[PDB]
Amino acid sequence: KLDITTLTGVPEEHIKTRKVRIFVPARNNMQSGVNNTKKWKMEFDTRERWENPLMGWSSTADPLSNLVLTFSTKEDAVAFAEKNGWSFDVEERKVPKPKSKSYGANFSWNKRTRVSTK
Amino acid sequence: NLIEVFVDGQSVMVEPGTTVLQACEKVGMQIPRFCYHERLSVAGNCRMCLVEIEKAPKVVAACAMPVMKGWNILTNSEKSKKAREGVMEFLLANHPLDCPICDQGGECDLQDQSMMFGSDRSRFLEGKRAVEDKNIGPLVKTIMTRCIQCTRCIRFASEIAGVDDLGTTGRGNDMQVGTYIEKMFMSELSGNIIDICPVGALTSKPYAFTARPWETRKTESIDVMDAVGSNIVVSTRTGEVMRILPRMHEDINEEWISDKTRFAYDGLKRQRLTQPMIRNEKGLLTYTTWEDALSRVAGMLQSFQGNDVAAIAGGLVDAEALVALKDLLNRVDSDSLCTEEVFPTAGAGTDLRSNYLLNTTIAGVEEADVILLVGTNPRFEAPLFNARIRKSWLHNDLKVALIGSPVDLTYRYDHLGDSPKILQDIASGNHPFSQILKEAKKPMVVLGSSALQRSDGTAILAAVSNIAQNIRLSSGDWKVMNILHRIASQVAALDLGYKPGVEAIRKNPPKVLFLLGADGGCITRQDLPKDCFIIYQGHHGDVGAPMADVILPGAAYTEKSATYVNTEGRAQQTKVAVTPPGLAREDWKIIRALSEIAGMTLPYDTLDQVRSRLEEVSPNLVRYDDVEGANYFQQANELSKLVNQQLLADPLVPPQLTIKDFYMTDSISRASQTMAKCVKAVTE
Amino acid sequence: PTTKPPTARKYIWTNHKFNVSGTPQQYVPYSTTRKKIQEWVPPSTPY
Amino acid sequence: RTSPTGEKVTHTGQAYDDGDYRRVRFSDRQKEVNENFAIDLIAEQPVSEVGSRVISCDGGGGALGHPRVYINLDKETKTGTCGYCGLQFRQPH
Amino acid sequence: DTRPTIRPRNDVVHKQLSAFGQYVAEILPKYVQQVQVSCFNELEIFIHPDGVIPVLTFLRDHTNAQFKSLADLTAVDVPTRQNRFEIVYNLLSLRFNSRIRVKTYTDELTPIESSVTVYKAANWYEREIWDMFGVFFANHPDLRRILTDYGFEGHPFRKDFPLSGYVELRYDDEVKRVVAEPVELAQEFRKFDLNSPWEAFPAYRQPP
Amino acid sequence: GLREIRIHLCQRSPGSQGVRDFIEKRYVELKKANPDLPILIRECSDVQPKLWARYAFGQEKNVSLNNFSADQVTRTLENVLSG
Amino acid sequence: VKPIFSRDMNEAKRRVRELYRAWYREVPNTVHLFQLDISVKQGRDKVREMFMKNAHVTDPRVVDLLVIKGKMELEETINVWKQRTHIMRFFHETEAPRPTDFLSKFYVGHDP
Numbered sequence A: 001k002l003d004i005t006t007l008t009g010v011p012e013e014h015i016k017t018r019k020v021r022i023f024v025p026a027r028n029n030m031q032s033g034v035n036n037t038k039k040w041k042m043e044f045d046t047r048e049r050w051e052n053p054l055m056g057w058s059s060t061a062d063p064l065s066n067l068v069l070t071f072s073t074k075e076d077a078v079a080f081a082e083k084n085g086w087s088f089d090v091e092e093r094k095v096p097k098p099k100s101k102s103y104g105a106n107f108s109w110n111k112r113t114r115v116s117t118k
Numbered sequence B: 001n002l003i004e005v006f007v008d009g010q011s012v013m014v015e016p017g018t019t020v021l022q023a024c025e026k027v028g029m030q031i032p033r034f035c036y037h038e039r040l041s042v043a044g045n046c047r048m049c050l051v052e053i054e055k056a057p058k059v060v061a062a063c064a065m066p067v068m069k070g071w072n073i074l075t076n077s078e079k080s081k082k083a084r085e086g087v088m089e090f091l092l093a094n095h096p097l098d099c100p101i102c103d104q105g106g107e108c109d110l111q112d113q114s115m116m117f118g119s120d121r122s123r124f125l126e127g128k129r130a131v132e133d134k135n136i137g138p139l140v141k142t143i144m145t146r147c148i149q150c151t152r153c154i155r156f157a158s159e160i161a162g163v164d165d166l167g168t169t170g171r172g173n174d175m176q177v178g179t180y181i182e183k184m185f186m187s188e189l190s191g192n193i194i195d196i197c198p199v200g201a202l203t204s205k206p207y208a209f210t211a212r213p214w215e216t217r218k219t220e221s222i223d224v225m226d227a228v229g230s231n232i233v234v235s236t237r238t239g240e241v242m243r244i245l246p247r248m249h250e251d252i253n254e255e256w257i258s259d260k261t262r263f264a265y266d267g268l269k270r271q272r273l274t275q276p277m278i279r280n281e282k283g284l285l286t287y288t289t290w291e292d293a294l295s296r297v298a299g300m301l302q303s304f305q306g307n308d309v310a311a312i313a314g315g316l317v318d319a320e321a322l323v324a325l326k327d328l329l330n331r332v333d334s335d336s337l338c339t340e341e342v343f344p345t346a347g348a349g350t351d352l353r354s355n356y357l358l359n360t361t362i363a364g365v366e367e368a369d370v371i372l373l374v375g376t377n378p379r380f381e382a383p384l385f386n387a388r389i390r391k392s393w394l395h396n397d398l399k400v401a402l403i404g405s406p407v408d409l410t411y412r413y414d415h416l417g418d419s420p421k422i423l424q425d426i427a428s429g430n431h432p433f434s435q436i437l438k439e440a441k442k443p444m445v446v447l448g449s450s451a452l453q454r455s456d457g458t459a460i461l462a463a464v465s466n467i468a469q470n471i472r473l474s475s476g477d478w479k480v481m482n483i484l485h486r487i488a489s490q491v492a493a494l495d496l497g498y499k500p501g502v503e504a505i506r507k508n509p510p511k512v513l514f515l516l517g518a519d520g521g522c523i524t525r526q527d528l529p530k531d532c533f534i535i536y537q538g539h540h541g542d543v544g545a546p547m548a549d550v551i552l553p554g555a556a557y558t559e560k561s562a563t564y565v566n567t568e569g570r571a572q573q574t575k576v577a578v579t580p581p582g583l584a585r586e587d588w589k590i591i592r593a594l595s596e597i598a599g600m601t602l603p604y605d606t607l608d609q610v611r612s613r614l615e616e617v618s619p620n621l622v623r624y625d626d627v628e629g630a631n632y633f634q635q636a637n638e639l640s641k642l643v644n645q646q647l648l649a650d651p652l653v654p655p656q657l658t659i660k661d662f663y664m665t666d667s668i669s670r671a672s673q674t675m676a677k678c679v680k681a682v683t684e
Numbered sequence C: 001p002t003t004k005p006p007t008a009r010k011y012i013w014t015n016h017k018f019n020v021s022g023t024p025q026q027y028v029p030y031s032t033t034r035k036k037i038q039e040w041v042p043p044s045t046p047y
Numbered sequence D: 001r002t003s004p005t006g007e008k009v010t011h012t013g014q015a016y017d018d019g020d021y022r023r024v025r026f027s028d029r030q031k032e033v034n035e036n037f038a039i040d041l042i043a044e045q046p047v048s049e050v051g052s053r054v055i056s057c058d059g060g061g062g063a064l065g066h067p068r069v070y071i072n073l074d075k076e077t078k079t080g081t082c083g084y085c086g087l088q089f090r091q092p093h
Numbered sequence E: 001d002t003r004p005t006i007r008p009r010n011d012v013v014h015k016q017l018s019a020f021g022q023y024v025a026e027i028l029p030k031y032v033q034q035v036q037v038s039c040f041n042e043l044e045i046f047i048h049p050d051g052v053i054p055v056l057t058f059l060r061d062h063t064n065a066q067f068k069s070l071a072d073l074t075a076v077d078v079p080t081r082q083n084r085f086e087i088v089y090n091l092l093s094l095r096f097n098s099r100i101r102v103k104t105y106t107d108e109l110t111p112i113e114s115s116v117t118v119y120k121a122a123n124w125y126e127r128e129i130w131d132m133f134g135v136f137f138a139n140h141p142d143l144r145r146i147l148t149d150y151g152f153e154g155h156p157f158r159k160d161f162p163l164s165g166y167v168e169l170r171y172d173d174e175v176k177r178v179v180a181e182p183v184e185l186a187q188e189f190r191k192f193d194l195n196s197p198w199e200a201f202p203a204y205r206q207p208p
Numbered sequence F: 001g002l003r004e005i006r007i008h009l010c011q012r013s014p015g016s017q018g019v020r021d022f023i024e025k026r027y028v029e030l031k032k033a034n035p036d037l038p039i040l041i042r043e044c045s046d047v048q049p050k051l052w053a054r055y056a057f058g059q060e061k062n063v064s065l066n067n068f069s070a071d072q073v074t075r076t077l078e079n080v081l082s083g
Numbered sequence G: 001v002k003p004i005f006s007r008d009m010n011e012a013k014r015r016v017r018e019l020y021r022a023w024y025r026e027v028p029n030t031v032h033l034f035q036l037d038i039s040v041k042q043g044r045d046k047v048r049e050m051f052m053k054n055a056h057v058t059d060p061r062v063v064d065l066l067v068i069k070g071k072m073e074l075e076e077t078i079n080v081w082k083q084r085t086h087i088m089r090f091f092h093e094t095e096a097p098r099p100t101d102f103l104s105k106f107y108v109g110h111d112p
């Protein structure tokens, strides 16, 4: 098994305490486009983001707070997480169901699908 | 049955009646669209989905035109490109130059589709139109000059929301969408018209001007406002929750969330518990370190044992915290772990999971033909469940009958009455609806958990079980018995062996009460000994915090990775979006630290170890997004037959009767000012 | 500017100031937004 | 305006509280506060009257203003307000 | 298409590069895996990682391929592959006035033969590839850090390496020296989600 | 001394058929005999069935039920119920 | 898979021992040349500590790569390419001790 953890140079705190999530990003509900929901992505766990005293900017001590790796398939992401010794959490991809849509149902004769306005 | 069509020459097998747009989606082509939505009726008026069919002289509308066998769809042909460019030009001819000031900017379908399929300049040398804004409520900010008359909001209201208030007035270039009169679009699902609308015509008033989409960080989590367990996306920016958006889950909430789920995030920024508080010699709560408060609670735990120590689980508590508190109170040999929602303990009780679960599942509603609602208001207790019921009735002709107060469910039902004696009539076959239940090939009976809060809850449960058993005997593995919860923590507590109700605490008054975020006020200081020690562990100080001796600041559902089980027994895990404010910590961490200080150290130190402990108590709390099949209904019915209570003559009145009683239910909702504005608007 | 005067605006300073770094009139940065999360005020009445 | 501590308040309402250590940065120095609150300056502008039902404001100067927007003037109870400029317009009534 | 906005396409160079790619593939079938010619007239030859020295030496010495100048030598990190590191060789032929590309692959452990014997320029390029990505080049005269700090740990140009790193420097008055401490940022790098949800180029659509 | 009883059985696993039959037949009798003792029936997935018994002061013991029979489950529970 | 320098862990362990001898015999020079304010034992213990961190490694390819990086670190120390700041970075001094106890972590912050 690949154990490249000793070669990546990551400190121990960010190898064992981390919790990598492997998922396909959900579609932005504000848009009908689905081009972003095609590649598997890998992100770490959110950590403390305190307020900088001088300016109020959101400070952080998490070096891995902006890492978003994109993978073609779930298996590749799982393998990459196993390579670096990161506790991965895979979420199964959710694909919208095929839906039976009929424009003629808008004017049904004995059904509730009859619309009152167009 | 599969006919064969071609998308850009490539063969694809599609079902008869499939539209051109779905045929193109099968191969991976997403035809541009404004009016078409998967969950709304086909309109065909935006005309953006026009595509060229080979050998055909006219461009069809992919959103409406059904495919015919042998058709070759030329998605990227020159006719399609020119049609898309012309339609985009017509759409942008009268559109206002509000992009810098439009909140849809950066996440606007019209912008992206203009960039991808439209032209790069304008030939419109005339003056654009202007539309007077219409006020439709305190939530949806309306700038109607940006409307492209795609009629998504109208169809969504009329079908998913049942509110036939939105519509088009006038004709031609002067057609205007919105209510003709100055009326407020009041609905529990009104917030979704902000999402369906492609342009920034309808925008979230609380979210107005606060942030841009490209900078927000998206954290996928689970809603805890109701028991539906809707999947949501917490959009954070620089460590602050900016908005909440729905996340697609076909089996739970499809694409929608309730108004409370969408707009109650602002409650997380008010009246928060940030630092531990202990009571001084003046009887007033004063700030203190974790050391002092934990030492006090540990000493009080070491002093009393047995029934003298009790704990009341709240409404928004997580499974990990529940199991941690259970183990901690078992270390002092105390089984007084009580929830705030009363479930009938007599009989099978919280031993068989299917006894207290929506066994038919939310997605199962689309399969039923007859549904009986017993003493509940699903429009407010579980808005997404009510929406699913409405969808089933609209597309499957699902006969719905309600036993209770005649509330408006946004769909027509059969109001059998409001007396529990009708349950006996149905069970004994006297009521005509019993014959209808016999006729139904996949009947479904749903009992609201709010009805079980009555003193005769056990009798009501027994009557519903009798009806279900009569259906089972008289008429595959279709579950009939169902209980619709209203609390995000009830199911997990029942799975973790928590006693369903404060009856045990009333029976046995404790001296150490551990209020774990319990703001319901079921047990007060007057119902306890005059020297009871109360520790409140929560995020908002609403009710329990004032009547407590030590305050331990907890975390909210957006500030911790936590397991919540919805009304159908599907365990789901939230993800951390922001960190708890001030000195607040994760609940199970607080419990474990308290246990370590009190000597009785719990056998877990990390989240994974706590979830391993959850599996030891119940393995179903670690299998996320999995509705495990368990029927065990015959045993439950037989055990309920043992104790025969009496149905009271009181009518079945659900706690929520109007939209006013829906916005403010829990601590987060009550702390929210948006919910206060909504309540004021719907009352006045 | 004597020949072509600058356009007169009411918001334009009527007294130009040199670089005031190192003087008491220097610029000190600070946050301009209000406090985000409001803490809970405990009741003043005993139990 | 002035906060109770004696510290001038900005147009955003920000003012360090008396129980805030961050106010010490202003001890031997000043607090930079703009004295031209825009919200007060626009409300000072009069409401223009135009007989037409729809007008267009570019902020003045043409290309030196903002994107051109068209404002409806049908509501007699309120005045059409430019999204960028903030200028108000009213149809004579 | 045509007209000023579009970029003119030269078919002659495309044909010549395709012919030369076929030529190279025929001469070296043991290592050449794939040959491509991009629409903007750039030739790429894909070579099995054992073919670094043979193919490069052929492209340097062959009378019909005098790529005597090593234009560039870089690596591309694609963490979605078994061999994430993709080593790219850019060559220049002053005799025929053309350029060619050679692409191989390697893991985080499998070494690559050093092309110093072929091109003397490959020395520092391979040192930089090792420093930035972690790829080890066997039979290299002197492989060590070239761009990172002397006591630096980790290979930064990897896709999984954080942008801000893990450690930061400052001067401490107690120890009278510059000291490395875990990185803490006054303001966090605001990650932007910019990709549009709509497909931009239909010609690159991957199969479902 | 006993406080609660937890029985974990997988839905379709052949090694839990005995536990499934026991729950189908004798669970009602067990609950009738012991009214106030929670027999928590949860479900496993592709793992050996187990019987958990929590005693006083948070002391829990587990007994494997893999490839058992309803008679053996009854015997084990009787041993747990009494001693 | 093709090896880097050794085909067996025993062969890989041989190179580790060779590196340790070079590191062990270099520490007295490192303290002398860099004018460190530590003892020879501290440096030699530090070398042992850094070697013991990579003691769980079992893949010979990773072992070879660690030795390759180990030789590179030694060359910088021998050639005085490193400075006193670089050498003393192993001895974390300005870093405050971070407790590993749960209750200590609970008191400090939200660190998991």
Ligand code: SF4
Pocket: B095, B096, B097, B098, B099, B100, B102, B103, B104, B105, B106, B108, B109, B110, B111, B146, B198, B199, B200, B201
């Ligand atoms: S709706 Fe979209 S295109 Fe129209 S102004 Fe707003 S951002 Fe621009």
Ligand code: SF4
Pocket: B146, B147, B148, B149, B150, B151, B152, B153, B154, B177, B196, B197, B198, B199, B201, B202
């Ligand atoms: S308001 Fe929005 S959703 Fe409604 S018709 Fe206009 S563009 Fe469509």
Ligand code: FES
Pocket: B032, B033, B034, B035, B036, B043, B044, B045, B046, B047, B048, B049, B050, B061, B062, B063, B064
């Ligand atoms: S998407 Fe088909 S006409 Fe609008």
